[PDB]
Amino acid sequence: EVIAQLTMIAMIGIAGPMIIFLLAVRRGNL
Amino acid sequence: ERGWFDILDDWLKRDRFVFVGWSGILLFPCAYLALGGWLTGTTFVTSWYTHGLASSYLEGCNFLTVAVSTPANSMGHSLLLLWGPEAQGDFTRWCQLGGLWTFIALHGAFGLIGFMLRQFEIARLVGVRPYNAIAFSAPIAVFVSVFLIYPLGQSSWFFAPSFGVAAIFRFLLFFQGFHNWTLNPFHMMGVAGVLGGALLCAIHGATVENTLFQDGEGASTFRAFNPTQAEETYSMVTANRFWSQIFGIAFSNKRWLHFFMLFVPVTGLWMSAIGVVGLALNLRSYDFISQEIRAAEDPEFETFYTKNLLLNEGIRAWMAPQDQPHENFVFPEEVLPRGNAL
Amino acid sequence: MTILFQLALAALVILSFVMVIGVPVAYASPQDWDRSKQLIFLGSGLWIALVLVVGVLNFFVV
Amino acid sequence: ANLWERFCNWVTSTDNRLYVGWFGVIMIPTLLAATICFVIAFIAAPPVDIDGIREPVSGSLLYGNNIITGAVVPSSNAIGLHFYPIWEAASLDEWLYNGGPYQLIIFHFLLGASCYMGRQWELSYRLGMRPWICVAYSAPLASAFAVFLIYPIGQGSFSDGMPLGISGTFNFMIVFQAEHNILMHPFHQLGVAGVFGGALFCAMHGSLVTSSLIRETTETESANYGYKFGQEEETYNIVAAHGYFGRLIFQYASFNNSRSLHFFLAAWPVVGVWFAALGISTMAFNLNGFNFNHSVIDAKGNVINTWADIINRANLGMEVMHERNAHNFPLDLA
Amino acid sequence: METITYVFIFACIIALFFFAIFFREPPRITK
Amino acid sequence: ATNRDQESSGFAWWAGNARLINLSGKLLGAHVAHAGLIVFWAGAMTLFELAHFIPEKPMYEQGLILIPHIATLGWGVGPGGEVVDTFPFFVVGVVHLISSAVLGFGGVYHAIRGPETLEEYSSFFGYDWKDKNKMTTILGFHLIVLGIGALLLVAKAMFFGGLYDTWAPGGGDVRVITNPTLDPRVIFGYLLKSPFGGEGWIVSVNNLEDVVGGHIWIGLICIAGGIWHILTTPFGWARRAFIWSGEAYLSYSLGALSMMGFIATCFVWFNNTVYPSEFYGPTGPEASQAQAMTFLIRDQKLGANVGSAQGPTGLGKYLMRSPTGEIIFGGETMRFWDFRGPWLEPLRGPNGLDLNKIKNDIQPWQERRAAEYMTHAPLGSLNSVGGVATEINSVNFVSPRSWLATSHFVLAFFFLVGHLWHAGRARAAAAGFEKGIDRESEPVLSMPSLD
Amino acid sequence: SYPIFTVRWVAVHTLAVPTIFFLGAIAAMQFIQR
Amino acid sequence: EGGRIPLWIVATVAGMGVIVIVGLFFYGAYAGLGSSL
Amino acid sequence: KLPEAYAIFDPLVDVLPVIPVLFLALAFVWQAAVGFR
Amino acid sequence: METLKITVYIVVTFFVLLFVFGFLSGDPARNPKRKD
Ligand code: CLA
Ligand code: CLA
Ligand code: CLA
Ligand code: CLA
Ligand code: CLA
Ligand SMILES: CC1=C(/C=C/C(C)=C/C=C/C(C)=C/C=C/C=C(C)/C=C/C=C(C)/C=C/C2=C(C)CCCC2(C)C)C(C)(C)CCC1
Ligand SMILES: CC1=C(/C=C/C(C)=C/C=C/C(C)=C/C=C/C=C(C)/C=C/C=C(C)/C=C/C2=C(C)CCCC2(C)C)C(C)(C)CCC1
Ligand SMILES: CC1=C(/C=C/C(C)=C/C=C/C(C)=C/C=C/C=C(C)/C=C/C=C(C)/C=C/C2=C(C)CCCC2(C)C)C(C)(C)CCC1
Ligand SMILES: CCCCCCCCCCCCO[C@@H]1O[C@H](CO)[C@@H](O[C@H]2O[C@H](CO)[C@@H](O)[C@H](O)[C@H]2O)[C@H](O)[C@H]1O
Ligand SMILES: CCCCCCCS[C@@H]1O[C@H](CO)[C@@H](O)[C@H](O)[C@H]1O
Ligand SMILES: [Cl-]
Ligand SMILES: [Cl-]
Ligand SMILES: [Fe+2]
Ligand SMILES: [Mg+2]
Ligand SMILES: [Mg+2]
């Protein structure tokens, strides 16, 4: 089903930018 | 002295993000409408009534197949103005009749004039020589010969290029099949100017980048240039030796080099335009008479020239009925030229 | 068994997603490294255990 | 210094009017062999049975061609990808009938041109230059490899390699369109962007530098005498050129860094032509241009033609006519 | 006569290459 | 952050990975993480392929490139290449995907958490590019690893079920290789074969005995070579011939991979032994031969004497002679007479195609196969519309052979560019002029003029 | 300090405004069936 | 407030929006009008 | 098809192969966050 | 033809040998700066 596929890709898609965002907020070693 | 003209002149020539100028009064509306007309047509407008084709995203075409198509052959060379005697003010019918084609072509033409005027205006204000405007005469020669002169010599706008990717491809193949345009020496000079221009672009860029002086510590060498520096950033002497030893000849004069870079592709495009002016009248380089006399008398004589005419003959017979629907061509299977099996 | 398999594989996916974000974030974070280290060790051990669990349970549901 | 040492020194000498070099040791004999054979063949070779159907095509001037129609004709379809050197023929008469000169020329040319590319690295090294001019030349080289070698390999015959002639070139193009719909292939479209853009940027750079030449000459003399070979000072005003072009479009659309500008001039046509080369090299294995034939259908199921279908009609005309005596079975599979 | 003409022009071009390379105006460094 | 901007590293962001040249710990992280990507793709792509896989449809109708690689090894398939068990495909996919997490973990750790350089931490794992003995030692380790890999193929073929054999007597089937070719005159004879038509260099390998024995030789050569390189240091002539730097070594490998990519292109295009047509579709040569076979069969059934049938050109319509006289299919496929395939060989005698066999011995299975292959020729559009450019939409098909040949030509070509880029740069950097010409020491200014 | 409405503002919006409109229109077209 | 939402977030979100819309356009090549079906 | 026991994770399997591409894109998100220094 | 084959085989070998041995003759040292 197309919605399930789209939900999966959205969550995988956000994971990358999320890592960066979390590290930016935490003043991490980017 | 400081009247309304001079005040208007001040405002037009303000140093702003997008320069306007007097030329902007012509340029911006015509360019905007040409582009807007194209985007509008390719998104929403059909070619069903002019060509029997779908041509918009709305109809299911993609980026490669959408087009603003030329008007029907029965329109002749009608300017096809919205308020003209064909559409009579009706916007919907105007779209259905191919009014967007003349709209785009004509606004496009006045837009290019405005752009070249802009090139002249800015050059005067900044105090540089107007070589950029001059080089732009080539794109103008091409647009005018192909989109205006060509169809004007033919039966109608119908045979002008339609504004689309695949539609332009169709135009290329039509020119091969009907005009044998590849055989034309003016097209050949055009090809030499374009490919020679691309060659000069690549070779000059690469030569400069590979004869750079080390003017910084960086292994990435871009930061080691200052716009206001007096010195050449690359070695002309080293560049010259390299090429002299590799190719036999090299530039030694930088001013000649850069002028030659203008000259080559500009001249090429001009030559191709002259060829198209000829094709407007079906004045083609279609044949070599000597080849035809020999081939007609001698059925064992064959060259790549004779091979290509057979392809043209196929193109014409196979594409014409759908490509020229106003002719109502019905070619029964039996008359179609075909080789064995295929 | 089928429900065990189902939830073990679900847990494996969820943990994987948490680790995918958590491990790099922890590795490049200044504070809470002591807190992070042990969780990464726990996360890794559990991840491996779940792989084996899903691996074995595979044959009792297929 | 011994004989070998002095020879090596001469070969690699930076003082030769034309650099020889190690690549040159291979380049010189192969390009001479290819050139000499080409000229003789273009003038004097008898008709060649390109399609292996005992239908010899005349390519040479003395056999009824002019400059435009003349060609060195590709080797026979009967040969396919078989190596056909002179010594494999029973005689020169046979060798010529079967298109032996084509193979001799293209193999020598491709080797020599590969060594031409190597030589460009080599001299750059000897002169203490940066090394990437040869990388720029790889674009046209790859394109020569595409039409003379890769395409024939993919199709299983040197008879489908591009002919060494003006009209033979057009023949190759038209048939290529029929069989691969190259116009609708994005790599060829990139190629066009590369060459149209390369010409555009060539005219652009030429015009902008010429526009901003610093006054060093009188009205009655050519402005080119304003630049002297090897002068240390730059001959035009880039700040003025940028001030112009930045106002023509907008400021951040124009280059003020000459190194970045020239990199762009190198990269645009080179990358585009790489894609062009890759178009031909991948259509060599029949991954063809986009096919939207009958893509648009109405509610009932009537085909509503697009410009793609009109392209298709033109392609069909080329297809049914090409090599009119060569096909016995309904599909043209290579 | 056509073959002669074409071969003549070609030969003249090749001769021109020779002179353009070996009997060029030598590049001379100045300021 | 150390060396993580242009001013401190000398490299702009777009050449950011060049900042890693002398940072062995981070560079190890880069490599291990990358290997994780490769393994990730192999696993995830396999699972995707299996999820979309319809077992009764040919693989080559389904856009599969990985399952065919698994099947060729003898896993999951039976006679005629029929799929008997999809579980082996699942295993390969899962294990790769699982393994990719482990590599990803190691890569991410070494890249951003572990020691930035390895030299102070470990003499064993640390390295200097200019240390020629250490460089050849690491090379030696990897050669052993590769030699073991080649022997794993031998192991599968000889002791663990065998490999799919398209040439198996009675028809294609999985077959255990009991008698691999060890004769060095045969194995190394392939290497000296012309790459041209009818010869085809190593791409000509046409039986599994030669394939397996070749890997025995390669396995042992790589192990021996690896040991050799651990125990020795480069000779004088080698030292004077090569540039010794990280970028130089990268460039040699780039050139090597380019060469390999080009070879793989021709392999998948021409070879129907290690790329069985049952899984990958017919070769271009094969499909063309199969069309001639199809119409020979059809027309002969209709009463045609196919031996005496003169075509329009005067050459035989169905059958003609090769330039050395062998009887071959006529029409344009005359170019493809070097083709050899299991469906066709039964009709071949010492003189080429045998007219008696053609008249009398063509089996329905041969007819079926020829028809299958003729209509699955490797021709198709970028949007996967099968057939010639002029075909109408209907058949969703592009051959795995086309996908694999094209992709690897593109890759091989760019890798040649990369080789020239890095080889040229490595030479310039070692000589000390990669950043430009010294204004006060411009080499050309100290040379005599050419004229 | 900075002006809000400028010639630049107009030029940007003459392009931006129809672009987004058109993109929504073409987005909707992707769900049309014959 | 001129500088609150970091530019790298704007670029990432804007870029993702482009991928989604173009992705939708590609999906449409296989469904409904222009799909050949 | 995947074995029946895994059918629910099918839409996830459909999207996994693209993940490598996302890693290339991620490098650009990261570089944007550090100002391409 | 046999004589031609042998001649070309010898010619080609000669030039190939020159190329290989030529590049083996301390090529990295043949530059204007650091001769190593
Ligand atoms: C400088 C900008 C510019 C230019 C050069 C053009 C030029 C053109 N337009 Mg475009 N247009 C523009 C801006 C521009 N337009 C703008 C801003 C819009 C949005 C409203 C449009 C919308 C538009 C449409 C819908 C159409 C055009 C069309 C045309 C064409 C015919 C115009 C014509 O015949 O008018 C004739 C008028 C003049 C030349 C002006 C006369 C001024 C004189 C000197 C003064 C005398 C007038 C006097 C005061 C009035 C007394 C009359 C009285 C006796 C009744 C031509 C290519 C048509 C076309 O493309 O068809 C294919 C068409 O259908 N335009
Ligand atoms: C195969 C792709 C690849 C890989 C493996 C690397 C590897 C690396 N790069 Mg290069 N890079 C790449 C492509 C890649 N790069 C591309 C395409 C560009 C152009 C945009 C660059 C531009 C670039 C620059 C300018 C620099 C690097 C640097 C580095 C190193 C340090 C990175 C850092 O400091 O993180 C900081 C970032 C973070 C801490 C954020 C988190 C990043 C992690 C690794 C994400 C992992 C997520 C993953 C899904 C989690 C799985 C965990 C699970 C297994 C449990 C690292 C070894 C740096 C260097 O050389 O150091 C001296 C450096 O300056 N890269
Ligand atoms: C060896 C490489 C390779 C090959 C031969 C294939 C082949 C195939 N794939 Mg797989 N795949 C790959 C890698 C590959 N893929 C990668 C890297 C991914 C991650 C995205 C995938 C994920 C994937 C999915 C999800 C699917 C496929 C599918 C398919 C099939 C149809 C492909 C198609 O329609 O393309 C369309 C063509 C394009 C999209 C054009 C590609 C253009 C690229 C970007 C050009 C690259 C040029 C060069 C590298 C750029 C460098 C620039 C230079 C200047 C530096 C076909 C069998 C489909 C299938 O049928 O599955 C059963 C399918 O659904 N693949
Ligand atoms: C080729 C890749 C590679 C290399 C050369 C190294 C090398 C190193 N690692 Mg790294 N790492 C890797 C990948 C690699 N690692 C992977 C895949 C993971 C995830 C499990 C890790 C996780 C990791 C951590 C957490 C640490 C290291 C550490 C170390 C250092 C000491 C290790 C040691 O002394 O082992 C001694 C030898 C053993 C313990 C026995 C090895 C057992 C192996 C796995 C058996 C199988 C071998 C076989 C060839 C593998 C085939 C796999 C193949 C199919 C891919 C050393 C610099 C340490 C460090 O850097 O110190 C600060 C450290 O803390 N590694
Ligand atoms: C990844 C694989 C690999 C790599 C990178 C190396 C690297 C190296 N080896 Mg090692 N070697 C290997 C595998 C490898 N080896 C294996 C598997 C064995 C076991 C047989 C050996 C046995 C070995 C020995 C005995 C020696 C080396 C030596 C060397 C060094 C220089 C070799 C050289 O100049 O080659 C380039 C080759 C030449 C200069 C010879 C002439 C080149 C001709 C023209 C090549 C002809 C092929 C041509 C490209 C086209 C034909 C196609 C072909 C595929 C058939 C270098 C450090 C030398 C060394 O210094 O030892 C410490 C040395 O004496 N190796
Ligand atoms: C197997 C698996 C998994 C995994 C995962 C992963 C591994 C992931 C990842 C990931 C990732 C890895 C992600 C990502 C990403 C991303 C992105 C999303 C991006 C992007 C981008 C962009 C959009 C960009 C842009 C830009 C910028 C920023 C700058 C400049 C400009 C531009 C505009 C270009 C899981 C857990 C699910 C579970 C099950 C299985
Ligand atoms: C005609 C007309 C008019 C007008 C109009 C207009 C002015 C319009 C407009 C318009 C417009 C103005 C529009 C728009 C648009 C758009 C669009 C539709 C877009 C898009 C896009 C895209 C889709 C993108 C993409 C891409 C690219 C290009 C590159 C790379 C990547 C990508 C893929 C991102 C008027 C009323 C006067 C009148 C009459 C007629
Ligand atoms: C250094 C660096 C980098 C890189 C990174 C990397 C490249 C990585 C990685 C990574 C990786 C390489 C990873 C991974 C992973 C994985 C995972 C996480 C997994 C998993 C899995 C799972 C969970 C599964 C499951 C399952 C099963 C068991 C069965 C059937 C179904 C399924 C599929 C559901 C970048 C560029 C960002 C930049 C900066 C730095
Ligand atoms: C079937 C093939 C099997 C391959 C076997 C592998 C053997 C490899 C052969 C290596 C022999 C080459 O050895 C190489 O020869 C030349 C020419 O004499 C030497 O001599 C050279 O010395 C210096 C090097 O700076 C040069 O300036 C000089 O012009 C030249 O005389 C090289 O210093 C030496 O390294
Ligand atoms: C827009 C058309 C341009 C034609 C220019 C004619 C200017 S006309 C000129 O304008 C002056 C102020 O500008 C006045 O002082 C003066 O009375 C008037 O004759
Ligand atoms: Cl033809
Ligand atoms: Cl045929
Ligand atoms: Fe310049
Ligand atoms: Mg649709
Ligand atoms: Mg699914």
| Rg of chain E | 15 Å
Termini Cα gap of chain A: 38 Å
Structural class of chain A: mainly alpha
Give the CA-based shape of chain A: rod-shaped
Question: Quick one: how many beta strands of chain E?
Answer: 0
Bound molecules: chlorophyll A, beta-carotene, dodecyl-beta-D-maltoside, heptyl 1-thio-beta-D-glucopyranoside, chloride ion, fe (ii) ion, magnesium ion
Strand content range of chain A? under 5%
PDB class: electron transport
Keywords: Photosystem II, Electron transfer, Light-Driven Water Oxidation, Membrane-Protein Complex, Oxygen Evolution, Oxygen-Evolving Complex, Proton-Coupled Electron Transfer, Photosynthesis, Reaction Centre, Sr-Substituted Photosystem II, Substrate Water molecule, Trans-Membrane Alpha Helix, electron transport
Entry title: Structure of Sr-substituted photosystem II
Chain A: Photosystem II reaction center protein ycf12
Structure report:
- This is part of a larger assembly, with ten protein chains of ten kinds.
- Chain C has 62 residues and is mainly alpha-helical.
- Chain C has one domain: Helix Hairpins (Orthogonal Bundle).
- Helix content of chain C is 82%, strand content 0%.
- In chain C, helix 1 packs antiparallel against helix 2 (33-57).
- The longest helix of chain C is centred in the first third of the chain and has 26 residues, at 2-27.
- The radius of gyration of chain C is 14 Å and the shape is elongated.
- Chain C starts with a helix and ends in a 5-residue tail after the last helix.
- Chain E is mainly α.
- The longest helix of chain F is centred in the C-terminal third of the chain and has 32 residues, at 400-431.
- Chain F has 451 residues and is mainly alpha-helical.
- The D-E interface holds D 17-18, 39, 43, 61-62, 66-67, 228-232 and E 2-3, 6-7, 10, 21-22, 27-31.
- The complex binds chlorophyll A (5 copies), beta-carotene (3 copies), dodecyl-beta-D-maltoside, heptyl 1-thio-beta-D-glucopyranoside, chloride ion (2 copies), fe (ii) ion and 1 more.
- Residues 10-11, 14 of chain I line the site of one magnesium ion.
